[PDB]
Short mmCIF file of C-alpha atoms in Angstrom, two decimals:
data_model
loop_
_atom_site.label_atom_id
_atom_site.label_comp_id
_atom_site.label_asym_id
_atom_site.label_seq_id
_atom_site.Cartn_x
_atom_site.Cartn_y
_atom_site.Cartn_z
CA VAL A 466 31.49 -21.39 29.33
CA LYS A 467 32.12 -17.95 29.53
CA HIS A 468 32.78 -17.18 25.65
CA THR A 469 29.69 -19.74 25.24
CA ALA A 470 27.45 -17.85 27.49
CA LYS A 471 28.36 -14.88 25.35
CA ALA A 472 27.78 -16.19 21.94
CA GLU A 473 24.21 -17.62 22.72
CA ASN A 474 23.22 -14.25 24.32
CA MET A 475 24.46 -12.33 21.00
CA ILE A 476 22.37 -14.58 19.09
CA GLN A 477 19.32 -13.52 21.00
CA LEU A 478 19.79 -9.91 20.95
CA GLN A 479 20.55 -10.08 16.97
CA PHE A 480 17.16 -11.35 16.49
CA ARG A 481 15.31 -8.76 19.12
CA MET A 482 17.07 -6.56 16.61
CA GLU A 483 15.11 -7.90 13.30
CA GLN A 484 11.79 -8.05 15.03
CA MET A 485 11.32 -4.33 15.37
CA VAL A 486 11.35 -4.21 11.42
CA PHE A 487 13.43 -1.06 9.73
CA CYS A 488 11.42 -0.56 6.74
CA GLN A 489 15.20 0.29 4.93
CA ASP A 490 15.13 2.88 2.30
CA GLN A 491 17.27 0.59 -0.06
CA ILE A 492 14.71 -2.04 -0.40
CA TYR A 493 13.97 -0.72 -4.11
CA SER A 494 16.11 -3.60 -5.13
CA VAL A 495 13.95 -6.34 -4.30
CA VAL A 496 10.88 -4.16 -5.20
CA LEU A 497 11.54 -4.09 -8.51
CA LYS A 498 11.21 -7.66 -8.75
CA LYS A 499 7.66 -7.38 -8.28
CA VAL A 500 7.22 -5.58 -11.66
CA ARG A 501 9.62 -7.80 -12.99
CA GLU A 502 9.61 -11.56 -11.97
CA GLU A 503 6.19 -11.57 -11.09
CA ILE A 504 4.22 -9.24 -13.73
CA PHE A 505 5.52 -8.35 -16.68
CA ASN A 506 7.82 -11.61 -17.21
CA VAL B 466 -37.97 28.97 -5.88
CA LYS B 467 -39.27 25.69 -3.95
CA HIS B 468 -37.22 23.86 -6.54
CA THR B 469 -34.39 25.85 -6.57
CA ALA B 470 -34.14 25.27 -3.04
CA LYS B 471 -34.90 21.62 -3.19
CA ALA B 472 -31.90 21.47 -6.31
CA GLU B 473 -29.01 22.94 -4.48
CA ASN B 474 -29.26 20.77 -0.74
CA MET B 475 -29.04 17.41 -3.22
CA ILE B 476 -26.09 19.23 -4.72
CA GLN B 477 -24.47 20.14 -1.68
CA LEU B 478 -25.18 16.80 -0.05
CA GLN B 479 -24.04 14.53 -2.66
CA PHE B 480 -20.34 16.13 -1.86
CA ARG B 481 -21.39 15.37 1.86
CA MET B 482 -21.27 11.77 0.87
CA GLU B 483 -17.90 11.81 -1.49
CA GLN B 484 -16.20 13.10 1.87
CA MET B 485 -16.39 9.34 3.02
CA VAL B 486 -14.42 7.24 0.66
CA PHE B 487 -15.68 3.61 -0.54
CA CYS B 488 -16.10 1.59 -3.52
CA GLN B 489 -16.77 -2.52 -3.72
CA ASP B 490 -15.35 -4.43 -6.61
CA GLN B 491 -15.88 -1.75 -9.42
CA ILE B 492 -12.37 -0.95 -8.69
CA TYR B 493 -10.54 -3.86 -10.15
CA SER B 494 -10.47 -2.92 -13.80
CA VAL B 495 -8.99 0.60 -13.09
CA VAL B 496 -5.86 -1.12 -11.49
CA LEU B 497 -5.33 -3.29 -14.80
CA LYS B 498 -5.26 0.53 -16.31
CA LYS B 499 -2.68 1.31 -13.79
CA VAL B 500 -1.15 -1.93 -15.06
CA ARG B 501 -0.92 -0.85 -18.58
CA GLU B 502 0.17 2.26 -18.20
CA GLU B 503 3.01 1.87 -15.51
CA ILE B 504 4.56 -1.55 -16.84
CA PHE B 505 3.74 -2.63 -20.39
CA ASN B 506 2.47 0.62 -22.31
#
């Protein structure tokens, strides 16, 4: 039970960090795919 | 002097308008200009 309640709480905690939407300084990798896949190619 | 005075106010005024940025559907072809100089050219 104890370990179960911890995993469950950890999962919700981890989705609360993704919603605040940190726009990272390495998105570039996938920025680049805009001007490759979607326009030039 | 009448028409010097008239001319200058209008020339001042037009620059008063430009501060207020806008442009409707003309801006489309100058994005294509971006498209040509950033990618293909």
